[PDB]
Amino acid sequence: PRRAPAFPLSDIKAQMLFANNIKAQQASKRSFKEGAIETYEGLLSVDPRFLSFKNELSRYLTDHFPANVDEYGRVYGNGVRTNFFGMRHMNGFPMIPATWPLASNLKKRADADLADGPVSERDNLLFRAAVRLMFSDLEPVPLKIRKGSSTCIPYFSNDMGTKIEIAERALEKAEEAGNLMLQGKFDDAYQLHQMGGAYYVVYRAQSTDAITLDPKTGKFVSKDRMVADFEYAVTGGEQGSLFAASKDASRLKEQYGIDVPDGFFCERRRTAMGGPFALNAPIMAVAQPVRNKIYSKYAYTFHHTTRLNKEEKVKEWSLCVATDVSDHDTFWPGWLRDLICDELLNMGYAPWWVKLFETSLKLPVYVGAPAPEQGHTLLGDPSNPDLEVGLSSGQGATDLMGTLLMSITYLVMQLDHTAPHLNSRIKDMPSACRFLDSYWQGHEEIRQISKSDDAMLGWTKGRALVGGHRLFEMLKEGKVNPSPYMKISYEHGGAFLGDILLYDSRREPGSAIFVGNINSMLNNQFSPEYGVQSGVRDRSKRKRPFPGLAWASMKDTYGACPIYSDVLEAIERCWWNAFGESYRAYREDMLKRDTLELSRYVASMARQAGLAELTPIDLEVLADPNKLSGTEADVSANIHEVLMHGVSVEKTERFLRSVMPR
């Protein structure tokens, strides 16, 4: 539908996206870059010994720990759900090329038989109900900011003091910018308060994507990842091409003189979009309050933390189906955006605010460098935001957006295939609301626990139960997509929020237990997404603040894995063969070192008083913060201080009062 506008960095429109400083300008022109990461201090992802280690362990662990997942994708036995070839990637060397991000996802949704709006009056009521229940009685709280993160367009600052002004000033001028926007003065809102502009594409890594070995030839094979080229992207796929990127890493010997072991591959790269802080702030200010309501009041379906916690919810179920949404963010419907906005307006949210929100989800995107000799292009015209790319990863409330979309979708699936005897309880907004409120609280024979594209669907004894099994069956045959909204299937080797649901011979939620995902321990330890950035002084700013700390939480996390100790033995053994050293030793040193270094940051920790008071999860997050966006409550207070910094509650309260319908 009408190719999207595109402009070269040279055009004033692009140029106007980066402040006249230094980062900023490097962000514009930054070019394609790849390179072996420093997995751990003084250890390169491609160090021969290391590769040799990866090569041996991968094969070993695979020959001795077959996956145990049944035809319904239920994982049993050893808890292993796939092979260990993920480690065979050359961390730091991305598949060429990355995909250009689609400017419109309408043809896509359509060509997938996905609805371009609620298909039924019932559904429409449900979605709206979710908006009402989610955005209703919020309580103001300070706007927390991640330490080290970038403000992006226009300034690209990593500096907290600055981030705090930017943010504070933003709430000051949010209303004025939104209004500017209501009148269509985009360029004005942007130039005056930097609210608008574009999203800044950055390509993140998937250091472990599927690899399989052909039993016949012994040759290895990596999952093919389709990618759109510019043409295809600026036309929403009506033109251009869609092909497989190349994960072949042979090029590495000839380009870097890097000896590449047989069966190793280039990493998969995911497109990530960093938002314009000025604009996300006013949005975040509402987002977190929303997270608190749902995490509190509808904690049944939305608040998960503790294998036990989760487990306890599932065991009560007669049937637990684990789903799988496909390419969720690219498919997320622009129409849900519009509806959410609509209802919000009806709830009486400040139109200017709704407008900002709306716009945050139509914004152009500046593509950096998806491959050599490629990129530095802005798709979409900021003067008037009209992109339809789905969920932009850097929008201030993308978790909420995916959840709102998905939760309802899941519910509708249950209604559709197993509980028509409930439709009568959803006859208007009021009933719709009461119904959903009940649903989300775990009080219906059809239950759900989820978080965006990750969820488990439940059935208790009741009429729906027989339907439940049919649905489960449908999903197994996988010949028909059960939702009119997204492409859903079952998780083969189902798991939720990282933990694996280990069934027993009974194969019923009743006697199932959540356990760590052994494959995740190895991925995490030998295929990290980021090096350790030893060159960065402030650790709180690093992607991996305290590597060593993981060792501490390890046993707590993966201890109940049926093969936990065997794996460790295996590692140790292979590490010896490759480094002539004790891997365990190594990690303990790192632990000690970090534990000390840690107190240099945390105050309520004597400059030698160590851990103890830390939760396995803190230990988990300090090692890697992308490990809990659950919230600033699932983590020790002294901890958030380490990784976040908030804006005055006084300031947000003032702000919120003006947005809230009341």
Curated annotation (Swiss-Prot):
E.C. numbers: 2.7.7.48
| Domain annotation RdRp catalytic: ranges | 309-484
Reaction catalyzed? RNA(n) + a ribonucleoside 5'-triphosphate = RNA(n+1) + diphosphate
Which portions of this protein are annotated as coiled-coil regions?
Answer: none
Top-rank taxon of the source lineage equals: Viruses
A Pfam family? RdRP_1
Per its record, what are the GO molecular function terms?
A: metal ion binding; nucleotide binding; RNA binding; RNA uridylyltransferase activity; RNA-directed RNA polymerase activity
Function description: Rna-dependent RNA polymerase part of the packaging complex that packages the viral RNA segments, replicate them into a double-stranded form and transcribe them.
Q: What is this protein called?
A: RNA-directed RNA polymerase
Origin organism is Pseudomonas phage phi6
